[PDB]
Amino acid sequence: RTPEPLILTIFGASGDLTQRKLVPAIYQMKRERRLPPELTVVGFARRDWSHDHFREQMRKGIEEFSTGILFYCSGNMDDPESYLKLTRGNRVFYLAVSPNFFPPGIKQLGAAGMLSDPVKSRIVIEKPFGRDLSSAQSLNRVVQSVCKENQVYRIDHYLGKETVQNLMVFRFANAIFEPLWNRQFVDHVQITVAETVGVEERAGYYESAGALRDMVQNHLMQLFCLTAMDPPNAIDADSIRNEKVKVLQATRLADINNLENAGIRGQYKAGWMGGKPVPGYREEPGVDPSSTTPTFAALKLMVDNWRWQGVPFYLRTGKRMPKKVSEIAIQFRQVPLLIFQSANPNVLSLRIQPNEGISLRFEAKMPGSELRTRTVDMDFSYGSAYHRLLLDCMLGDQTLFTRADEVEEAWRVVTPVLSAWDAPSDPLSMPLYEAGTWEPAEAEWLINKDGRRWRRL
Template sequence: MVALAPNPLRIGLTQERVPAPLLFVLFGASGDLAARKLIPAIYRQFQARRLPAQFALVGVARREWTHEIYREKMHAAVEEFAPNDVGRPGVWGDFASRLFYSPLNIQERESYLRLNELLDRLDREQNIRGNRVFYLSVSPKLFPSALEQLADTGMIADVSKNRIVIEKPFGRDLPSAQELNQIVSAVCDEKQVFRIDHYLGKETVQNMMVFRFANAIFEPLWNRNYIDHVQITVAETVGVEERAGYYDSSGALRDMLQNHLMQIYALAAMEPPVSLGGDGVRNEKVKVVQATRVANPRNIAACAVRGQYSSGWMSGRQIPGYLEEPDVNPESATPTFVAVKLMCDNWRWQGVPFYLRTGKRLPKKVSEIAIFFRQVPLLLFESAAQQLSPNVLTMRIQPDEGISLRFEAKMPGPDILTRSVDMDFQYGTAFGTKTADAYDRLLLDSMLGDQTLFMRSDEVEAAWRVVTPLLTDWEDPDASHRVSQYEAGTWGPAAAEELLTKEGRRWRRL
């Protein structure tokens, strides 16, 4: 039988958790994600002895590779993308002996039958007892074919032993997400499905739950009575790189805000769960997303801004504008920057705005959530900065992972003047180790059958409903002129600043 889900009173467990004997089947095994993230992550779990003794990984892709060629390719990938994790030759040799490969045309039934024969043989040889995880690291347009073929060949028939991991994007709008959910539900049970968003695997994202629910001093303040507003920022310094074909059809709204930022938002805004088990957390996330809306759905321009980076200077070199990037449509209206004001219509958050922003070619790579508390009701003290700053609690997801609290303190001297100071916690300093890669945790959870950090079908659809007014407005051909330009290396278009300044607020300086 598959290992039971972890004790719901525990979170962040590592070495205590070892899956049952398992076959891990990786679709898209020759792709970039497999080489950069998935294989190095699984290899690190193997080195840390978190995988079962009876474990094998079967790579699946179109290329006509042999087992040996696949092992050589994956060794080269670990050496290139995780050189510090290569380890001793004997350790890699042991891991490589567990790697196998099966060429597969994702739409051809015979390919799946050959794959199933290999899986059955490995199952018998290693006494794996039918436990299998199928990881679909392929183009979203291939999800339906892969799911239907896996179902038709009986490879995902056992609800208790067979699981499917699906990479984002899960749809490109609400109707396509609903259609894909219908396909998934037709071939397997929701308990078998693991919709992965790697942001939920980050230690600092998970720490939001610990910070809120394991410390009595913060949760009583986590509401409209004490919080003025919340800012969530996910900024990237890179452009579209080699992803222009995909990115130009998605943009910042679909690629980042609908999934990554909404996941961070849900964890920050949700009610305390009844347990930290799978559905305990996911039930509360769904509730808060279902209660969320764009601030003014009848006037999108008043509560949301989209932008596109133009040519500018970063790190001493000139950066081409988005429309000048290779493979980008020179008339594209695809946003590379999005800022939006959300409201949550529930008892805890009524009237508290959440400002979310994300963009490419911004000055700094940073992901954080900043909680701005209300000003004190009576200003008794003068500030050296002429104006008292609000208390701000900041959770840094990356880089410099940690938490800081800004508050007012008296400056030395005979006068009673205050200045803002920071009380800071850093993961690296406190624990003496760097945080693990997000995929390390999520891959292990999928093998264990722990769905806590994976999205459920109703949550995916609820997130798409939140952004649907933006998609509807921005994809109107007559609205293309509203794409603001911002120079590469700046913090987005001026309209993004005005989104807050018109309400007497401003974005946190990063």
């Protein structure tokens, strides 16, 4: 709502990410009576140009990727004093640079003295943020010596402003669901995120990422905290992150000694997708013919407090799955009686990605003259990316950006399975599944051993 006028600058040379995506996003929101006309988006890169030789570059991508129809200070990074060469006195910095450029790029910026104000300047950083627990802790120390915890924005994932608020109003404004969210009535919970695309062109990035560093830490660890936290005192941005952090300090893997009851991996083979054949992962361009690089990942978690004792959590994600979905399923206990010999347990679902809504399933009597029960259903549908982030940066509200406290608390949970999986091994014992199959056969025994089974989505 009416962001204050400021000046924006860019880093990281002239990569196509900003010009084709970020610049059109600002232009699109400009013609909507949202941003003030006084913006003066100052450009900056690592290549010689002129003030007019790059103005047409914006038009080269705006109409080529969007609906269609500014000062250049290019210098030289290879000098320890280049920053000295560089409205209402406001600034916003961008760090669209290589992963190995942040510690160089923040130290000299702090030494310059531009980031010496609490309100005028802010700095944002690009994903990823470290590669393990040790690498993130060291990077957090450099940030703390140049800035405060009010001007740093980390872009890890985008869940949506309207998706978080839809869940908070459902649990905390109804007197019929909260008493049932505890260990006395719930049996187990399941979380699933599915995809139908393989690595298309990002073969150079996914090779060193895997499926635990890509989606498990960022995405599935944020849907898990929303369905297991305590009621906050307010919806204020810093009143929810405290409750989200508090629940991450009681979370642990189910088994630590034997890392086979709390984790499986996989990698997809050749198969049939959408009526056409598709190649295997190892035969794709840019991929080494003998690599592990997990694509599937299933984990089991436990929480130790007065509310969630004895209730396990199951997390599943992967690529080349039959369909694209995202869901949370809560299953209750069996009825404490048997006068109805005939009773399947009750399930409450929360659909997210395909069609937002709420479902509830229970048991009803089958018409006739003999006591038999069936299963019925109830439904409710609400309907019947970069645009939101930049607005929140301009206003200055930080609820889509993770704090520096919970970044290092999610790296600690997945530490054992990680350190087990980066260890080199024989490139012939990796479980495989066809492109179009829900899961490898090894992941079916993880849940079936407890007497349960996965959900057919």
